[PDB]
């Protein structure tokens, strides 16, 4: 729905076992991969809250209306079976539609979270970098490992390396 996951980003990282979303960087020092905690925790909190909303015990008690050992009269029995079958159709429909809708909103929700993380990182880097289109921000200045960590910790200053990267 939001275009990030599955998605202008090619695929996911099987090596990213630390969280749902994260940053993977290549620089002059080497290559690294860390997990973004706030986005992952947000998606986990929303989806977990959804599951807790669906997981609920029915405190409504129903009593036995048929008899399995001595069958009730045929007419009232056919009315009972007819009603129970109607209710079964209603609840099967409700369950199918519920699961389908919740799955749709779940996938689109995670996609939205990824898009929000990417957009935030774009907010941090104003003219010091140019987005590529596959989920990467091409830097135009020597972003040290402390600079990358400042990007991950939402502390990167835009005016620190601005003019250094504008002319590139």
């Amino acid at each position: 729905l939001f275009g990030a996951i599955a998605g202008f980003i090619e695929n996911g990282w099987e090596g990213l076992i630390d969280g749902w979303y994260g940053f993977r960087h290549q620089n002059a020092q080497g290559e690294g991969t860390a997990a973004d905690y706030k986005s992952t925790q947000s998606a986990i909190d929303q989806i977990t809250g959804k599951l807790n909303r669906l997981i609920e015990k029915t405190n409504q008690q129903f009593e036995l209306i048929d008899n399995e050992f001595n069958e009730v009269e045929k007419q009232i029995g056919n009315v009972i079976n007819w009603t129970r079958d109607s209710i079964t159709e209603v609840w099967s429909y409700n369950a199918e539609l519920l699961v389908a809708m919740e799955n749709q909103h779940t996938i689109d929700l995670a996609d939205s979270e990824m898009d929000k993380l990417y957009e935030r990182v774009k907010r941090q880097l104003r003219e010091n970098a140019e987005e590529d289109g596959t989920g990467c921000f091409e830097i135009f200045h020597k972003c040290d490992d402390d600079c990358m960590a400042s990007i991950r910790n939402n502390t990167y200053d835009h005016s620190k390396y601005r003019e250094e990267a504008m002319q590139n």
Binding site: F23, R24, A43, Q61, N67, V72, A95, I139
Partner: protein, 314 residues
């Protein structure tokens, strides 16, 4: 610096509003299929009726002598249970069963019926205790000698409690007419019951039936709910099995029919004949006739709910 998401090598396919088989990272089941093959009754007053039928607890055949005044939160009917010792049947049977399942137990109280010039203790070999006996809560009204007649009597009982009283009486249909004259004398008999909400009627029908327990006679059982400060009246002149004690409902309970053993180690609030459904899921595919506090039955065997993003591997 590049941004991305996680993925797994083996995801779980789910269904959405647009597709069928979208592989996601993680998913969980919403339709319960796991069944516990026993009746989980931890912390509940349970009465396993066994060979005693639920309705028998009101009349009292030999197999129900230990259930005449039971008290329970959960009542369990068994397939081997029987309501009668002498061949017979209840009128409005299932309604009375449903009344007794949620009754919380029964409390017996003598009705105080006194008779004169009549036989009050008829017995049969089909209801065996020390010898030939009868229903513990009933009185088979016969004649003084091997024939004679049956004086028409009128008895009345006023429910002096604040709870409705379960009144159950019987009408004997002997194996032939000569037997009916041997037990109650010649002539056509009648049994009339009166009160403020009930109006009948009744009349016997002697004839040869099938030999159940070796006997060709039958016994009809009828019942009514006598409101507080209301009086039930029996005007009869033959073929009458009078109630000795009336029943009162104790409170509330749960009634189930099962064929699996009882287990006080596990707790459950959803029962069926095959066991107990212990689950937090909103749906179940085990038994559509499950009773108690159950998840809603659905036809689908499984409905996987996505708990993660879409799995997009390389």
């Amino acid at each position: 610096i590049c941004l991305g998401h996680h993925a797994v090598s083996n995801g779980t396919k789910v269904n959405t509003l647009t597709e069928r088989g979208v592989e996601v990272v993680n998913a969980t089941e919403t339709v319960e299929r796991t069944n516990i093959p026993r009746i989980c009754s931890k912390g509940k007053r349970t009465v396993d009726l066994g060979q005693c039928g639920l309705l028998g607890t009101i009349t009292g055949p030999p197999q129900c002598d230990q259930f005449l005044e039971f008290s329970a939160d959960l009542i369990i009917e068994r397939r081997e249970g029987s309501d009668v010792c002498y061949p017979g049947k209840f009128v409005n049977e299932e309604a009375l069963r449903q009344i007794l399942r949620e009754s919380g137990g029964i409390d017996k109280e003598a009705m105080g019926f006194t008779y004169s010039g009549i036989r009050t203790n008829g017995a049969t070999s089909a209801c065996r205790r020390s010898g030939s006996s009868f229903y513990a809560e009933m009185k088979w009204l016969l004649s003084n000698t091997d024939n004679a007649a049956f004086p028409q009597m009128t008895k009345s009982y006023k429910n002096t409690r604040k709870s409705p009283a379960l009144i159950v009486w019987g009408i004997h249909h002997s194996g032939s007419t000569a037997e009916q004259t041997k037990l109650y004398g010649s002539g056509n008999k009648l049994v009339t019951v009166g009160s403020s909400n009930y109006q009948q009627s009744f009349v016997p029908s002697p004839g040869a039936r099938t030999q159940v327990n070796g006997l060709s006679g039958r016994i009809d059982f009828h019942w009514l709910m006598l409101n507080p400060n209301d009086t039930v009246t029996f005007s009869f002149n033959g073929a009458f099995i009078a109630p000795d004690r009336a029943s009162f409902l104790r409170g509330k309970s749960m009634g189930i029919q099962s064929g699996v053993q009882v287990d006080a180690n596990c707790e459950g609030d959803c029962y069926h004949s095959g066991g107990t459904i212990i689950s937090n899921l909103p749906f179940q595919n085990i038994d559509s006739r499950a009773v108690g506090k159950c998840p809603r039955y659905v036809k689908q065997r499984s409905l996987l709910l996505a708990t993660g993003m879409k799995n997009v591997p390389e």
